[PDB]
Amino acid sequence: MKTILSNQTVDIPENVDISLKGRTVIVKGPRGTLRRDFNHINVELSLLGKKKKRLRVDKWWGNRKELATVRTICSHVQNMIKGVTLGFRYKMRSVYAHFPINVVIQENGSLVEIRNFLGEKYIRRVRMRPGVACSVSQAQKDELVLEGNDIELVSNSAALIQQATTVKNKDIRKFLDGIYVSEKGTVQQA
RNA sequence: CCAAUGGGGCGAAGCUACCAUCUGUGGGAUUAUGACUGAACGCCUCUAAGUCAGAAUCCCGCCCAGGCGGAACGAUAGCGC
Ligand SMILES: [Mg+2]
Ligand SMILES: [Mg+2]
Ligand SMILES: [Mg+2]
Ligand SMILES: [Mg+2]
Ligand SMILES: [Mg+2]
Ligand SMILES: [Mg+2]
């Protein structure tokens, strides 16, 4: 079955300016700008109102798979609003039974060195995605804080570190060592 | 000198032996898999749209040949313009 119309709307905070170049969404906020291209989805984007702006997503004559893309766009656009206003802050804890995991931040938070992971002599060097900054946590021991405006870049950056410290040829239910994503917050709490 | 290389010792050059010696190499997309964001299904979800890492595999490189396939350049005798 094709549905005549399926739509959803997004509310834009006053401090965020959204402009459309076709299906390219440009969100400008206090923390910067994010541009995402949605040309791989056949939807219709509309900006409504002037005082309280809104973004509308329309899908005319959509089957089940095409209808599922309508909310996906809204959620991405909301994350972009969240990124440019509050930012994204993933925290990671390093877990170890015997060998402390030493983390050194280089290149202004764009490179992470991991040493002595399960006692390995090999040094792991993880490169953060552009626009993502890693830093050791002054508040807690054995913790990292990744910050950025793009949720996917920040969360991909953290996945790289988490998968860098993988245990091999052991029972990973026993050998639990590794750095893991422990919290998903925002840079500015508001 | 002859004995169809008379026999035997040592033996140049050449050839030749893991029986001596030397040299044997880099990327790309990715598989399995593990994940990101994320609906579908207000939650969840590696998947649906989008995204990441990924290998004796695969393709290429390096290497071997070099097409009824080209190229630049030289010189061109009764011959070119
Ligand atoms: Mg064992
Ligand atoms: Mg005789
Ligand atoms: Mg001899
Ligand atoms: Mg590769
Ligand atoms: Mg996959
Ligand atoms: Mg890849």
In three-state secondary structure terms, A100 is coil
CA of residue A158 to ligand 2 center, whole Å? 99
Distance A41 CA to B11 C1' (A): 89
- Spatial CB neighbours of A51, under 8 Å, sequence gap ≥ 6: none
Cite the DSSP H helix spans in A55-150: 64-85
Q: Is the CB of A184 under 7 A from strand B?
A: yes
Element (DSSP H or E) covering residue A57: strand A54-62
Longest dimension (CA), chain A: 62
Which technique?
cryo-EM
* C1' of B65 to CA of A182 (Å): 60
The residue type of A177 is D
For B34, nearest residue by CA–C1' is A163
Q: E strands within chain A?
A: 3-11, 17-21, 24-29, 32-37, 44-48, 54-62, 88-95, 102-106, 111-115, 124-127, 132-136, 143-148, 178-185
CA of A132 to the centre of ligand 4 (A): 23
Q: In what order do the strands lie in the sheet with A124-127?
A: A102-106, A111-115, A124-127
Q: In the structure, how far is the CA atom of residue A108 from the C1' atom of nucleotide B1, in angstroms? A: 99
Reduce the DSSP state of residue A143 to 3 states and report it. Answer: strand
A40 touches strand B (CB under 7 A): yes
Radius of gyration of chain A (CA): 21
Tell how far the Cα of A128 is from the centroid of ligand 1, in angstroms.
Answer: 33
Strand B contact residues in chain A (86-105), C-beta within 7 Å:
none
- The answer to whether the beta carbon of residue A163 comes closer than 7 angstroms to any atom of strand B is yes
3 state DSSP class of A107: helix
Q: In the structure, how far is the CA atom of residue A155 from the C1' atom of nucleotide B51, in angstroms? A: 11
The answer to whether A70 CB is within 7 Å of strand B is yes
Tokens standing for A151? Answer: 């949720």
